[PDB]
Symmetry: none
């Protein structure tokens, strides 16, 4: 391994859910996104960002309806252009090892399309339309979002706080997760 | 390849979601588990089971908290010891090609631990405890199970029918589905 110093690999393992072997694999994925831009020596702490377009188009994200928001939220400046640090943070949260309540924390940030710390009916409608791939009628999307609010809006102000949202997820385990390899 | 007749491979391609070639390669995986137990000629339909202990050690299952229940449900006799047909059926349902409505049916079967056709509060507790993998306290699991029942139990008999379970899954979006990305 000639990319990082021992210390900086220990730090990545300390601040993500990944093993050293996983950090190395993901580094090479990141470098391969923009091979004429990303250097192969990170021991000098280069300041490098891969443009959003080359992140969102990667195989693991290109079909995710929230790829732009995901990259924005994890990017250093909120514009989707990502350092290696940002990239590893993103995939650490997306990994199998991340607790569900932690995924729910970042999902809130991603679905809060206007970054006002609430998921309102408009944020919900955008989210549900995206999640459902545009196959529901705008009229039916709106009705689904009404249902979610009636269930989860604990203080009846018509919108979901972070706590509203995380507790909704907590009460809804992923019963179909068993039947996947 | 002298493992199967043309008609056997056609029947497997029909009933599973796999191609003939994928069936052959799944056979290699089954035979690999117990290579002096599983014969190479299946044209006579030999009666052979691979023990649960070998099934549950597969990578597809060894880290799945429900591996015992999965093997039990797909096994011919409910003990986790699997014929080739059981093995193919299991992988077919677990495959990406399997419709979500079919995965939901088998999820219900697996979570119905005592096979009495309902998910009661005890089944649900065992299920949610396994799905949350220690992330929740026992107290939190109980509170979640009571909520799940209260919201999904259509006829308020205190248990989930297959209809109740199906409607629950259909009722709301998986808000975290877009946050499971392996690399
Ligand atoms: Ca390439
Ligand atoms: Ca908002
Ligand atoms: Ca609220
Ligand atoms: Ca078929
Ligand atoms: Ca072997
Ligand atoms: Ca039962
Ligand atoms: Ca699990
Ligand atoms: Ca009730
Ligand atoms: Ca309700
Ligand atoms: Ca019921
Ligand atoms: Ca009652």
């Amino acid at each position: 391994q000639t990319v990082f110093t021992h210390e900086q690999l220990e730090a990545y393992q300390d601040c993500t859910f990944f093993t050293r072997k996983e950090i190395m694999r993901l580094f090479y994925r990141y470098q391969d996104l923009a091979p004429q831009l990303v250097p192969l020596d990170y021991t000098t702490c280069p300041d490098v960002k891969v443009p959003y377009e080359l992140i969102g188009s990667m195989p693991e994200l290109k079909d995710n309806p929230f790829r732009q928001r995901i990259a924005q939220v994890f990017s250093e400046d909120g514009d989707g252009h990502m350092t290696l640090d940002n990239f590893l943070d993103m995939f650490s949260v997306m990994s199998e090892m991340a607790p569900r309540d932690l995924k729910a924390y970042y999902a809130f940030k991603i679905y809060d399309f206007n970054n006002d710390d609430y998921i309102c009916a408009w944020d919900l409608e955008q989210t549900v339309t995206k999640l459902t791939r545009g196959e529901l009628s705008a009229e039916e999307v709106s009705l689904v979002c009404q249902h979610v609010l009636d269930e989860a809006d604990g203080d009846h102000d018509g919108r979901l706080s972070l706590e509203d949202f995380q507790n909704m997820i907590l009460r809804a385990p992923d019963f179909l997760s068993t039947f996947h390899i």
